[PDB]
Design an enzyme around this catalytic site. Structure first.
Site, PDB file in Angstrom:
ATOM      1  N   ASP A 142       0.768  -1.185   0.148  1.00 29.49           N
ATOM      2  CA  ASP A 142      -0.012   0.018  -0.002  1.00 29.49           C
ATOM      3  C   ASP A 142       0.907   1.266  -0.018  1.00 29.49           C
ATOM      4  O   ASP A 142       1.409   1.716   1.049  1.00 29.49           O
ATOM      5  CB  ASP A 142      -0.973   0.077   1.336  1.00 29.49           C
ATOM      6  CG  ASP A 142      -1.943   1.369   1.165  1.00 29.49           C
ATOM      7  OD1 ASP A 142      -1.978   1.829   0.304  1.00 29.49           O
ATOM      8  OD2 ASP A 142      -2.567   1.597   2.290  1.00 29.49           O
ATOM      9  N   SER A 202      -0.679  15.647 -11.986  1.00 30.02           N
ATOM     10  CA  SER A 202      -0.906  15.216 -13.511  1.00 30.02           C
ATOM     11  C   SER A 202      -1.084  16.521 -14.336  1.00 30.02           C
ATOM     12  O   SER A 202      -1.831  17.473 -13.572  1.00 30.02           O
ATOM     13  CB  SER A 202      -1.929  14.361 -13.599  1.00 30.02           C
ATOM     14  OG  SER A 202      -2.514  14.020 -14.726  1.00 30.02           O
TER      15      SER A 202
END
Length: 330
Positions: A35, A199
């Site tokens: 994770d 992004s």
């Protein structure tokens, strides 16, 4: 040193991925959920409340000659999906894919929430976010990666998750055979303890690319792709009959639909998520309403590039002094 381990979807939907991990001496192999959005290595154990164990493999520290109680240490964690676990702490030898760390904090669960009990395939979590998020008190502990880092050939690990297929986690090296083209690296902020990056925009299907900064985290422990409501609405508007359902808990679409791809930007590069990756199947067995793999982050407080996004790429987690993230197509 290096390590390389195969990671395998737990079910037909790629809800999560498990990776075998050797703990203790002799080895006790547990299948852990790696994770990159948390920083605790915790396991079901001989200390876990019996009624909260249902099919998981447990770590028994009393059977490990290298286990030592970390006296006075406790841990307690809550995840974004509302699940939780807590317990005490041992140090022991932990190996992943041939890479061994001695003195790793192995957090033994005394209690786990229902979601964990109900998932027999996950024996615990192995956190790979920054150690500043680790929950051990009163002495915070380091992640497996942080402990391994100085011994690694290169201070990196990579995630290469499969779509309905096994994939690979590598430590200490970049497998140049595992991706196509070049890797585009992008800046990371560690201010929140995550692999947080920005992004450069998105496209829906064959549509034009929208240049827009989207801050979010690369999180292997989250199944879906959570993005701003504007972006998610633009995506689902291209699927006839799709709608956000308060009753179900997100966007659903007719199971008869063909889903468009979704593209996200990494600098000047583009990663394309095929439409099939965005199908999470019937909301309930036999339903003709299917659950979407792109959902709104509104009210999470952060955008999350979860498995839906990450499995479309080869992803480098670069833990050098100035950390960065790399994405390549594959």
């Amino acid at each position: 040193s290096t390590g390389s381990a195969t990671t395998t979807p737990i079910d037909s939907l790629d809800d999560a991925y498990i990776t075998p991990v050797q703990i203790g001496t002799p080895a006790q192999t547990l299948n852990l959920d790696f994770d990159t959005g948390s920083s605790d290595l915790w396991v079901f154990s001989s200390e876990t409340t019996a009624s909260e164990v249902d099919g998981q493999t447990i770590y028994t520290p009393s059977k490990s000659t290298t286990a030592k109680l970390l006296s006075g240490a406790t841990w307690s964690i809550s995840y974004g999906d509302g699940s939780s676990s807590s317990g005490d702490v041992y140090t022991d030898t932990v190996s992943v894919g041939g890479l061994t760390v001695t003195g790793q904090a192995v957090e033994s669960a005394k209690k786990v929430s229902s979601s964990f009990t109900e998932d027999s395939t996950i024996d615990g979590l192995l956190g790979l976010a920054f150690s500043t998020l680790n929950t051990v008190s009163p002495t915070q502990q380091k992640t497996f990666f942080d402990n391994a880092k100085a011994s690694l050939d290169s201070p990196v690990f990579t995630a290469d998750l499969g779509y309905h297929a096994p994939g690979t986690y590598n430590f200490g090296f970049i497998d140049t055979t595992a991706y196509t083209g070049s890797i585009t690296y992008t800046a990371v902020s560690t201010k929140q303890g995550f692999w947080e990056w920005t992004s450069t925009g998105y496209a829906v299907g064959s549509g034009t690319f929208k240049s827009t900064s989207i801050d979010g985290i690369a999180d292997t422990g989250t199944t879906l792709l959570y993005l701003p409501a504007t972006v998610v609405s633009a995506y689902w508007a291209q699927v006839s009959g799709a709608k956000s359902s308060s009753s179900v808990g997100g966007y659903v679409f007719p199971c008869s639909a063909t889903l468009p791809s979704f593209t996200f930007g990494v600098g000047s590069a583009r990663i394309v998520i095929p439409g099939d990756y965005i199908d999470f199947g019937p909301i309930s067995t036999g339903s003709s309403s299917c659950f979407g793999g792109i959902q709104s982050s509104a009210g999470i407080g952060i955008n999350i590039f979860g498995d839906v996004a990450l499995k479309a790429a080869f992803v480098v987690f670069n833990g050098a002094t100035t950390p960065t993230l790399g994405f390549a197509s594959k």
